[PDB]
Amino acid sequence: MKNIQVVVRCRPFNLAERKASAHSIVECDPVRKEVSVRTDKSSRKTYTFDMVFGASTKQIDVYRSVVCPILDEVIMGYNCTIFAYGQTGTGKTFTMEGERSPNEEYTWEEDPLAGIIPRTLHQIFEKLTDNGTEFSVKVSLLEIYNEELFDLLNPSSDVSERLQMFDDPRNKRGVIIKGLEEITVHNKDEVYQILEKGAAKRTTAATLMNAYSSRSHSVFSVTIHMKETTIDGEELVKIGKLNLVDLAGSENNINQSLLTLGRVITALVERTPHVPYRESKLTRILQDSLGGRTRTSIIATISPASLNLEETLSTLEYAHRAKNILNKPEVN
Numbered sequence: 001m002k003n004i005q006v007v008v009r010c011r012p013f014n015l016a017e018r019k020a021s022a023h024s025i026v027e028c029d030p031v032r033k034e035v036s037v038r039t040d041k042s043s044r045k046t047y048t049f050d051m052v053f054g055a056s057t058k059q060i061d062v063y064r065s066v067v068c069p070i071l072d073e074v075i076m077g078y079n080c081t082i083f084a085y086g087q088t089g090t091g092k093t094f095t096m097e098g099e100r101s102p103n104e105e106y107t108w109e110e111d112p113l114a115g116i117i118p119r120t121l122h123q124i125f126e127k128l129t130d131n132g133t134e135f136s137v138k139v140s141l142l143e144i145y146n147e148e149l150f151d152l153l154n155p156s157s158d159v160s161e162r163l164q165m166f167d168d169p170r171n172k173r174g175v176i177i178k179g180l181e182e183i184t185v186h187n188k189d190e191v192y193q194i195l196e197k198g199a200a201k202r203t204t205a206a207t208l209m210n211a212y213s214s215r216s217h218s219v220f221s222v223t224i225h226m227k228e229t230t231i232d233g234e235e236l237v238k239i240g241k242l243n244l245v246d247l248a249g250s251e252n253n254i255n256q257s258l259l260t261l262g263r264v265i266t267a268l269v270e271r272t273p274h275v276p277y278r279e280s281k282l283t284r285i286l287q288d289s290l291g292g293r294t295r296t297s298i299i300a301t302i303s304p305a306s307l308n309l310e311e312t313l314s315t316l317e318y319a320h321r322a323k324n325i326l327n328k329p330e331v332n
């Protein structure tokens with residue numbers, strides 16, 4: 001019924017990466033939707049994708065191109081998932097979250113470094129406010145490290161108080177995180193405080209665990225309840241859910257969820273009977289995002305530099321096979 005959308009976003013060279021060559025090692029053609037990696041010397045591999053975003057691609061463009069459509073399907077009542085996959089330092093967190101621009105030069109609302117989450121949560125209150133709907137928005141931020149489950153929006157618990165997971169009685173292909181805080185967002189003003197607090201707790205989590213950013217998987221969920229009255233006089237309810245996932249660096253028990261994600265994707269595309277969803281917290285959590293009833297997009301992030309060429313290639317081969325996975329999306 002529907003393929004997994006795969007897009008690529010390359011970042012500019014960072015201060016560490018040396019550009020030796022006259023012309024690029026990685027080229028991004030947004031018209032042909034291709035990436036070409038130069039690796040003999042006139043020798044290459046070209047990969048085709050659904051969208052391609054080059055080094056100069058601004059945040060607002062990633063949002064417009066990728067998320068605004070997905071946010072329409074969410075409002076129809078589809079479950080949607082976007083995950084960022086790639087090497088540490090390529091821009092997964094910059095894409096899904098973004099960064100904050102110093103000393104109040106921009107309201108969070110206008111910040112050019114703002115990423116998907118903050119923009120998406122702004123837009124929900126604009127789109128839904130005057131589309132006639134009567135609605136509620138609730139969000140949760142969960143992170144997975146060393147197969148353990150940390151809640152970053154819990155206002156009160158020690159961040160080292162980790163949560164449990166069991167199979168959802170009303171969804172053969174999902175789970176429930178017992179105790180996970182779901183915060184009701186009453187309007188766009190409450191959004192910053194909630195996300196700020198979220199990012200603060202993370203900092204705390206970082207001090208306790210080794211290389212936590214790179215090894216952590218982050219799952220931010222927004223859920224929209226929308227109720228409505230039909231011409232026949234009934235009461236139609238639909239539940240949108242959007243999963244914005246920032247994955248552990250492709251390069252990596254610490255790695256069980258990333259390993260298992262690979263094994264799931266491999267199984268799916270090669271059409272093997274057993275897809276081991278159950279072998280990791282992540283793949284148990286996203287089971288439905290990966291050959292199930294969810295609309296899934298991946299944003300594979302890459303470097304343009306020779307230093308990280310091999311992880312870039314890996315990341316390309318890996319995201320490219322994921323286009324072959326078929327989901328069956330369904331609403332309510």
Ligand SMILES: COc1ccc(C2(SC[C@H](N)C(=O)O)c3ccccc3CCc3ccccc32)cc1
Nearest residue numbers: 097098099100108111113114117118195196198199
């Ligand atoms: C979980 O979702 C989030 C998304 C965006 C923000 C962020 S930037 C967070 C940053 N990537 C970090 O890991 O600390 C931020 C940074 C500092 C202080 C507040 C905020 C809150 C929203 C926001 C708005 C615009 C730009 C960045 C950010 C935080 C959380």
Ligand SMILES: Nc1ncnc2c1ncn2[C@@H]1O[C@H](COP(=O)(O)OP(=O)(O)O)[C@@H](O)[C@H]1O
Nearest residue numbers: 010011012086087088089090091092093094095
């Ligand atoms: N698309 C981009 N444009 C400009 N700078 C970027 C881009 N992507 C990443 N960066 C910068 O590269 C660094 C690595 O980003 P980060 O989000 O921490 O990578 P990851 O989460 O993939 O490890 C950050 O300083 C960020 O500011």
Ligand SMILES: [Mg+2]
Nearest residue numbers: 092093213214
């Ligand atoms: Mg990161």
